[PDB]
Amino acid sequence: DLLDIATRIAISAIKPKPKSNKPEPYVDSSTINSLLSFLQSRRNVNELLLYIMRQAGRDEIDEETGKLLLASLKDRELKDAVNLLGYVKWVYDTLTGLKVNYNNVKGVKTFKELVNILSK
Amino acid sequence: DLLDIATRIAISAIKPKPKSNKPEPYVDSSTINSLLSFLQSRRNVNELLLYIMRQAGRDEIDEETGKLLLASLKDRELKDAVNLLGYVKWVYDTLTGLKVNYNNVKGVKTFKELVNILSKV
Amino acid sequence: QDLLDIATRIAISAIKPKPKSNKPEPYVDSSTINSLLSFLQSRRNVNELLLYIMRQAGRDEIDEETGKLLLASLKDRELKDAVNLLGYVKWVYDTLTGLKVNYNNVKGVKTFKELVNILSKV
Amino acid sequence: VIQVFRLNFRLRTGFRVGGGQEVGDNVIRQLRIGVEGVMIPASSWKGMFRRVSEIVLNSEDHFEEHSKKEVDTRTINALLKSDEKFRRIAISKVGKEVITQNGINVDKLDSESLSDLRRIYNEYNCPIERLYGSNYFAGGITISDSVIPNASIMERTHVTIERKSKKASEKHLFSEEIIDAEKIEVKVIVRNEFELWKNSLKLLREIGYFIGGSKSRGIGYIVLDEKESEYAVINNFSETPKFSELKRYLS
Amino acid sequence: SCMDLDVITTVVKIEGKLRNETLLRVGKGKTQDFAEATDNPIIKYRDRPLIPGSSLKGAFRSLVESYTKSLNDSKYYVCDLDDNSCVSCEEKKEGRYCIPCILFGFKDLASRVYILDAIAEKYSISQRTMVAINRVFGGQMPGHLYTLDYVDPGSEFSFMMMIYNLNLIEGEKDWKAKSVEALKFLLATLVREGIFVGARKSVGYGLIKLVDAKVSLYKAPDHLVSPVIVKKLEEVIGT
Amino acid sequence: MDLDVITTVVKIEGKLRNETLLRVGKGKTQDFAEATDNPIIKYRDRPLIPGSSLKGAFRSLVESYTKSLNDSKYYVCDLDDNSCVSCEEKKKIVEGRYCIPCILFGFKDLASRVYILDAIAEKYSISQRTMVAINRVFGGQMPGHLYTLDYVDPGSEFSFMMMIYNLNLIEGEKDWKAKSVEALKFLLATLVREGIFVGARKSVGYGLIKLVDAKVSLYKAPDHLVSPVIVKKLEEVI
């Protein structure tokens, strides 16, 4: 399902940023909102992937996170892409607002496992 | 049954919200209406769980109430989820309209107990 | 008889005029009690009816004291007696509304036979 | 031979069979019981079945109350001397003195007795009367009611729209009850193994008829199924009856 | 004589799926009657949105009345619903007839065309609140604020309609011919153009359109087990 | 007035090209497809103009036109006024005062004869613009009032469809309840050439729709209602 992919990519993106004064995610919500806005404005997948790659090259995006995003969006329709991006943004917002620790979500691969972890 | 779960959820959601200059519950009726409308429109339970998690992360839904909602709304049918949300909305509306103090109502875990409390006084 | 007394107590509680009103209207409306009966009929569950009346009381659409009395009466009733009680309540409320009886007349009548004595005299 | 049927109908939405509906108009009240809750009276079932059977037969004789032609008294005498049961019916109705064992006793006859005999002949020569009975006929079909333990009753309000200006006409607020259901179980016993009955059931299988009030407004539409419904034919009185799928009997 | 309900010659059943083009809003007779949803909820049969048969019958009758009055014929008239002195047909010596009275009945005569309810097997309910208040100043007054619930377009409703003693395929004669012509006109309008029904029709809320229909004609007393002809309504309305 | 006899059915179907970026509001609800707290309304990733907003804008413009007419025979009454009637003709004669906005867009006592559908978009594109305020003292500082709003691209087709009953436009009405056809034609001309302003901001230029072209199909009841009688381009109508 799309939600599993979204949870996995959000988990990969919630990794702590190395060499930072404070414990913060390696990827910021501004980047995710920029991804959504860019996809909505351009309405295509190719230059969306180009923008993702450019951001990943310019830090602020984990290499594995960028790889997962590229693999997910390698061949997807516009509606499926926007659905996945919205799910990713919502999951990342949940993780940030809940201040969930990365070390407790390193093993989740589905959405149900994350839901159970959050509930417990 | 479902009514007990709904009463416990409503009691958790009616706890006073700190850092608020006016006496009010932690959540608002708008949040409950949004929950019901989102569940009706999307017709999916996992999307409802995502909505609940995001609302909790927006510092507007009590974390205990969110945990209760997530615990209840897993491995549960769509119709059962709709019924539970309707019960929660009705109990919350009743508590808001009656202006029930959270202090003397947080100690009940059964719907029948709440009914007895309301009937007695 | 005893259900009649319960119903007439409920009705005289519900006949209290709604304050700050342009017209001398009762606190409880006919549509409200009709909705109560219909909801009980469709939803054959006493607890759901209790939740309904509690929500209506919280909505300031029915009298708080009348709601308290209804909740106390139907707190531990079955369905067959509950529908009969609601029907009797509907009957007595309709009689009071049609007869144009004010609260000050019935006041605190406890027995249905006394109420019909008043109606026969009046 | 006695044919026993247990019909089930998967009606669309609900149905409504009112009665009394108190006074004061306002809402429409479906008939109650007091203990069993709600039910469909057997008379309504019989009326619906008679309507369906009349549609199926499409007999012009039945359409004019079987009063369109003059029946010769010679034919009446021939039937009376040929049918023992018909003679017994006539004797039990008009009187033993009026109708002897052999003959009609024209001297004792008068206008009303002759009219009664002609009507009896016409109705006895009609399959619908022979099945459902008549004012003097024995009958032939027994239908039970369909009392439902469920009491789920919802209210479907209605409003009238002024044609000159599309708005609610503040003259009345029509309110109609409705009994939602999915399987109406009715037990029917027929004491006349008539191909008319089979044809009526067959018509109910595909077309299906309405039952109850406000049928013109989407309230009440039953269709007989061949899966839940079952039948049983009884010819011997020394064996326990056996029920089987209605499809074998109807298809 | 238009009271021929005693003798049933033919019965036709129209089965199809009704798909709304715009945001169809159910009638919501549950005015201020919440059951398990927010504010005023649309009516539904066991949590399944249902188009009332009465609503469709009323819309069809209004359309038929408009058509009959547009005919501007002495032989065909429409009487007011509240009037109790109206009659269906007059056999005075050629006579007058009432097409809507013939079709959907009156006080003096029951209906001939039964209309069933409709349920969307694939329904999608959405809500759209609207403040919608502006004045000389141009702001929004909080008093005027309302929310409504809409069934999204792309929901197909199980639609079934039955007609008695009218050959929509073979055709009819005399007043029955005019009645069949009016029914054909209504069906063609429903299939091609569509009919508004439900909420505010000014704003494009509620527009049903019959996608595909099966017309099964039955003639008594011979062909009642199976219909003689099952033809697409598209090929029936236009020939 | 007369609504039970449907005489003329007028259908206008065209494309609404959004001139400047348009923003329509919603009930602050949340969806995955948006990341803004106050996004624009859309149905399944398709931005659309609700028919209610178009109805309101048209009604306001027609009311302004009627009040600018400055004639006693045609009036505009308050929306919340319970004493207003669509028509108040009296036989003092046949002179009567009508309400053109009430005649067209309806009222509490009369339904609207002008059905307006919604308008979904095809070649749309959502654009986000961020605006912040400038404190007048110490000019340049952003006081934290940084609000970002969603918009539609400047130029995108919209499916427009409108129904008008009992108002002949191609042929027009001679003198009976007239000045309503004239008001409708004026509104259509303003929409086509100038284009009305709708949307959320509507003061900084955000939201200016325009109708490029629309076939006007007339359906008459007696001869053939399903078959169109006359089909003409909207430009020739005005």
Tab-separated table of C-alpha atoms in Angstrom, chain E residues 22-23 62-63 65-67 69-70 124 128-130 133-134 144 146 152-154 185 188-189 192-193 196 201-205 207, chain F residues 4-6 11 26-27 41 43-44 48 50-52 55 79-80 105 112 114-118 161 163 165 202 219 221-222 225-226:
chain	number	residue	atom	x	y	z
E	22	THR	CA	-23.540	17.345	-10.193
E	23	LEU	CA	-23.310	17.277	-6.405
E	62	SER	CA	-44.003	18.554	-12.079
E	63	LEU	CA	-42.273	17.872	-15.396
E	65	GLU	CA	-47.617	18.945	-15.666
E	66	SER	CA	-45.323	21.438	-17.382
E	67	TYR	CA	-45.389	19.352	-20.563
E	69	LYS	CA	-49.697	22.731	-19.997
E	70	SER	CA	-47.215	23.360	-22.812
E	124	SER	CA	-19.271	9.229	-1.838
E	128	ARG	CA	-19.152	21.804	2.155
E	129	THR	CA	-19.818	24.520	4.721
E	130	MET	CA	-20.576	27.994	3.372
E	133	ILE	CA	-23.203	36.449	3.695
E	134	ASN	CA	-22.337	39.884	2.328
E	144	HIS	CA	-25.661	33.520	8.440
E	146	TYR	CA	-24.576	26.919	7.242
E	152	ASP	CA	-20.290	13.410	-4.953
E	153	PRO	CA	-20.921	12.855	-8.676
E	154	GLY	CA	-20.153	9.362	-9.874
E	185	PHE	CA	-40.819	12.393	-23.461
E	188	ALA	CA	-35.879	10.938	-23.086
E	189	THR	CA	-35.459	14.089	-21.000
E	192	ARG	CA	-30.289	12.936	-22.371
E	193	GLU	CA	-30.778	16.191	-20.469
E	196	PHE	CA	-32.616	18.436	-11.054
E	201	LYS	CA	-31.416	23.872	-7.813
E	202	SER	CA	-30.081	27.358	-8.574
E	203	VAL	CA	-26.611	26.338	-7.490
E	204	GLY	CA	-25.875	23.163	-9.403
E	205	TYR	CA	-26.745	20.733	-6.606
E	207	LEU	CA	-28.815	16.462	-11.324
F	4	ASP	CA	-45.348	25.887	-13.570
F	5	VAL	CA	-45.472	26.323	-17.370
F	6	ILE	CA	-41.931	25.846	-18.673
F	11	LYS	CA	-28.702	26.593	-21.841
F	26	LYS	CA	-13.200	26.506	2.373
F	27	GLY	CA	-14.224	25.477	5.865
F	41	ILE	CA	-11.636	24.023	-2.242
F	43	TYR	CA	-13.038	17.895	-5.599
F	44	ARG	CA	-10.540	15.037	-5.963
F	48	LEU	CA	-13.392	24.280	-8.918
F	50	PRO	CA	-18.617	26.433	-6.400
F	51	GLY	CA	-21.889	27.386	-8.030
F	52	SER	CA	-22.916	29.124	-4.813
F	55	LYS	CA	-24.661	32.735	-7.774
F	79	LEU	CA	-32.030	39.133	2.056
F	80	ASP	CA	-33.179	38.784	5.678
F	105	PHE	CA	-32.141	34.464	-8.558
F	112	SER	CA	-34.682	30.848	-8.668
F	114	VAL	CA	-31.515	30.592	-13.192
F	115	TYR	CA	-29.746	27.323	-12.424
F	116	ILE	CA	-25.974	27.754	-12.140
F	117	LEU	CA	-23.728	24.702	-12.049
F	118	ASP	CA	-20.233	24.514	-10.591
F	161	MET	CA	-22.933	25.577	-17.556
F	163	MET	CA	-29.734	27.041	-17.177
F	165	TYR	CA	-36.117	28.971	-17.616
F	202	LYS	CA	-10.646	40.179	-4.641
F	219	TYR	CA	-34.882	24.521	-26.029
F	221	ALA	CA	-41.223	22.987	-24.915
F	222	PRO	CA	-44.001	22.727	-27.558
F	225	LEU	CA	-37.647	20.300	-25.890
F	226	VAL	CA	-34.884	17.685	-26.114
